[PDB]
Amino acid sequence: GSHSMRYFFTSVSRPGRGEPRFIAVGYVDDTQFVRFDSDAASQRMEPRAPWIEQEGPEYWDGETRKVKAHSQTHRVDLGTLRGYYNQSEAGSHTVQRMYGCDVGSDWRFLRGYHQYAYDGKDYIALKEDLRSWTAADMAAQTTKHKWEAAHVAEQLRAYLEGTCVEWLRRYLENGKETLQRTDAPKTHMTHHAVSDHEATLRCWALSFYPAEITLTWQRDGEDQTQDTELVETRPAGDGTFQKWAAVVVPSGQEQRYTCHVQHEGLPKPLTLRWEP
Amino acid sequence: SQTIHQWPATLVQPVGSPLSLECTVEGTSNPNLYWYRQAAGRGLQLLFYSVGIGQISSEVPQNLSASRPQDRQFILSSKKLLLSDSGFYLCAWSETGLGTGELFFGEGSRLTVLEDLKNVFPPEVAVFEPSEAEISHTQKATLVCLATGFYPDHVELSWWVNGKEVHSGVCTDPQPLKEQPALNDSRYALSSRLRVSATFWQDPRNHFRCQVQFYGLSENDEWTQDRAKPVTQIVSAEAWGRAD
Amino acid sequence: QEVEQNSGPLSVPEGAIASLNCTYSDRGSQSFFWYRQYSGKSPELIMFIYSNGDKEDGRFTAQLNKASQYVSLLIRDSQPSDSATYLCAVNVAGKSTFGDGTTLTVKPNIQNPDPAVYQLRDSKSSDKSVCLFTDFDSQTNVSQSKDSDVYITDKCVLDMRSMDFKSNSAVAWSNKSDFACANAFNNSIIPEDT
């Protein structure tokens, strides 16, 4: 199945007390493998997964230098943006950056991306063709004009399509147990009569990886259903993910429904049902 | 350099001596500053790297220090130099961030750490003049300047004609040769040639002058030798337009 | 190791093309460069590359092959002023790693030689003189001297000039009663004089 490795960068200005806070994190699929937090003593790019530790010292010294560079660029920005948006030195603002690789089942290149945001909104992003820029507002225009002048896109392309993919499959090869595993949903159900008449079933699913997973209810004629309270997939914390989707039915007339779990980890898609 | 400056340009200092090198960059901001060094043969070595103001980062167990007291003021220093410290120190910068890469270097700073200043001698310039045949077989005139007996290693030779200096029809040796490879301390020699139309040489009135720019000791720098202190200086020779 | 240039010095005849190679070991490298350094002056960038292929600028062409961790440089129609040290650089680990450089030497081309060894008189004293061997073919290396009681410099190609003319030259001297121009042993068809 497809894979990927992204890098998320967040920088928050703290007017009145020290340099902005810089927190960068690296993922491969749904697995974190590195991090950095200017508020840590370390002041080094740290590991967050077994395989990634195997990397040599030159690696970290290198990755650390880079990230700090990313951090420095963000700092400078934070200043610039206030400028572009006529905003006082008092307020706190936020700069975000995310870029990564997508590869196919054949570990080949699929798409690349590099997005930047300010105060929770899109500032400027590189299009799919790893060539064009999408300027959010009047401010971003200024940026995509200098970014075009300096042929930033070209540099990013070189990386996205080139380096990022190699190292991705490099990591996929070393984390061949983690990144390339595939846990399965330990599904289970729960009742919950809303007192007489109606009832609410809860179709659970815990301990699965990757997080991608669908669980839809159905019944007789056509499958589907609305009144289905589906909660966003959450991290179990141990590396797997939890999630469930509840729906509402009329006492008894209930044992005529069932949610269908779909997940690559499942050789055969499950269709759990109720049985009291 | 129209954006990066580095001084001093040449330093002949004694072992155990303190070092201070300054680098200034103009035309950009919050740039990446680096201290490379060129010793042994070629090849730069990264001694220091700064992501930003007041942020230094040694790249190798070292003896030198570095600081960035200001966005554009980069400095390299040593408590007391060791012979090892000799080398050509280069300061460079790359644009804030992490883009195409590409750093811009400066004048650079040559540091020769001597163990005993005693062996330091300035050069003795002696400019020879064209020869019988040449001017009448080639119709050309090749004066030859000859700086000799100097040490440390190198200096900067120049040709001045009736003032002004010239770069055309000139040629100076790639580097100096030991006046006796058997010694190490050996002093050096170096030559250059200025060839000019025989009719230009024969024209008395045309003043020729070779000029060697030697870099040595510095004022206020201990010196016990009986002779005069061999400090930086220009040592040149002359010659005029000679008919016949 | 890490960035591996081939040292030199290479010899290329004026006009020919100059090939330069560099090999990088860290596959993390993401941009490559070629700097030119003249004995004395500091390194000066000539080109940078960050995507497989060839990049052309004047008489210069860079060639990058990430697959081979191979980066090259060609100098079409090479000139004697191209002589210098070319430093290969690799932007990796948030910095630039350099090779120990590779010396280049573009031997000029003497259209029509005229080997001759003249002696120059010390304009300002008779006795202390030097021997000048010049205008020799671009082929011919100046051998070192023995009894280093005598000093001889390696050949020096002078900026011909506007008068269009490029010459090679070597100088020899020594303070002894004998020397007089007729030693630098090497090359026929060369006038002495006297």
Partner: peptide, 10 residues
């Protein structure tokens, strides 16, 4: 592997 290029000030 962090991006080694194409990152500049906005």
């Amino acid at each position: 592997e962090l991006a080694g290029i194409g990152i500049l000030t906005v």
